[PDB]
Paper text:
The Csp3s are the cytosolic members of a new family of copper storage proteins. Both the M. trichosporium OB3b and B. subtilis proteins form tetramers of four-helix bundles possessing many Cys residues pointing into their cores, and can accommodate up to approximately 80 Cu(I) ions per tetramer. The Csp3s can bind copper in the cytosol of bacteria conferring the ability to grow at elevated levels of this metal.
The 18 Cys residues, all originating from α-helices, point into the core of the four-helix bundle of an apo-MtCsp3 monomer and none are involved in disulfide bonds, consistent with the Bradford:DTNB ratio data above. The crystal structure of apo-BsCsp3 has also been determined and the protein is a four-helix bundle like that of apo-MtCsp3 (the α-helical content in the structure is ~81%, very similar to the value of 83.1 ± 2.5% (n = 3) obtained from far-UV CD measurements, Supplementary Fig. S5). In both Csp3 structures three highly conserved His residues are found at the more solvent exposed end of the four helix bundle. Copper coordination in MtCsp3 largely involves sites with two Cys ligands, with the most novel being Cu13, which as well as having two coordinating thiolates is bound by the side chain amide oxygen of Asn58. The Cys residues all originate from α-helices and the four-helix bundle scaffold provides the rigidity required to hold these residues sufficiently far apart to prevent thiol groups coupling via oxidation (in a cell this will be assisted by the reducing environment of the cytosol).
Author numbering:
A (entry chain C): 4 to 27, 34 to 82, 89 to 108
B (entry chain D): 4 to 27, 35 to 82, 91 to 108
C (entry chain B): 2 to 28, 34 to 108
D (entry chain A): 4 to 28, 34 to 108
The structure:
């Protein structure tokens, strides 16, 4: 069941991309927002295509989401990031 | 606002990616890949408020229409996405 | 890559320049930063489209030219952080993409 | 520094994309992995060029996908598959160095 993780990724993308634009000492949040939005997209694609690397991609996505949430924590972004990390860890297990 | 179009793009991505894997039809496979890729780009454009959002959506609609025509579930999602993208692109 | 090798190269060069500019600008530049991200991303897509003989390659190249033209215009308003180099690479890429798109 | 790894990723993208189109004109596993590998190589390039804080982790992933793509394409003797395998294995080795 990947529907819930896909939704969390999509929500995280949205929040990270909005935070990126609004932010534009925020250089760290901007960098992470870009990388997080990019890895979330990759995780969505991996889950939608049934990729053999879906779990590894999800694990990476969690790590990036956690870092992005820590740095933005911007508060909406941090929340969506931590939720997405949790869902990606579950998928990765 | 863009939530409905984003949702249609995401549904189209899902359907095109599922069709790509199941087909693996060479025309459908090629278009499935391109359509999924342009849907993802349209999602990003809407989420980042890109100045090229309308142009990207227009392109996305064209590719979705072609993908739907060739695949014609995927076809259904494609035509839905095309119409939502045309509305955004106006 | 008989007909696309040059345009591919210009897109690869533009990606490099835009990504470099993005990072340097981050260390009044917010418009350049945004466009650098968009332009690097579309250039990567155009490369993929050309390499895979994708049926929308010409349309993708036309979009790439438009985004490159805009990125070049915005980066061209700044005189450090690799912005003038980025503008040049953008304009080169736009011209090559317009040829491919024909 | 990343120039050599970038170059290997760019070469691997080229080979995977070429292999994808040639295979489409028992190759379904190669076609799938060609798509994923070309895509991750593009991401690794961006990560290196933008000095992204997860560049090392992305390079590690890119190595794993490259190794799998090479292993699968390496089972076939036309459609640019052997060339694709070689470029995949080269890339993987450069990415592993960058990921350290």
């Amino acid at each position: 069941y990947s529907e819930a993780c896909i939704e969390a990724c999509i929500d995280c993308m949205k929040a990270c991309n909005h935070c990126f634009t609004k932010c534009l000492h925020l250089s760290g949040c901007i960098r992470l927002d870009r990388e997080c939005a990019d890895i979330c997209a990759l995780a969505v694609k991996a889950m939608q295509t049934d990729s053999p690397f879906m779990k590894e991609i999800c694990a990476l996505c969690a790590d990036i989401c956690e870092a992005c949430g820590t740095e933005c924590g911007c508060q909406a972004c941090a929340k969506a990031c931590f939720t997405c990390a949790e869902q990606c860890r579950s998928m990765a297990a």
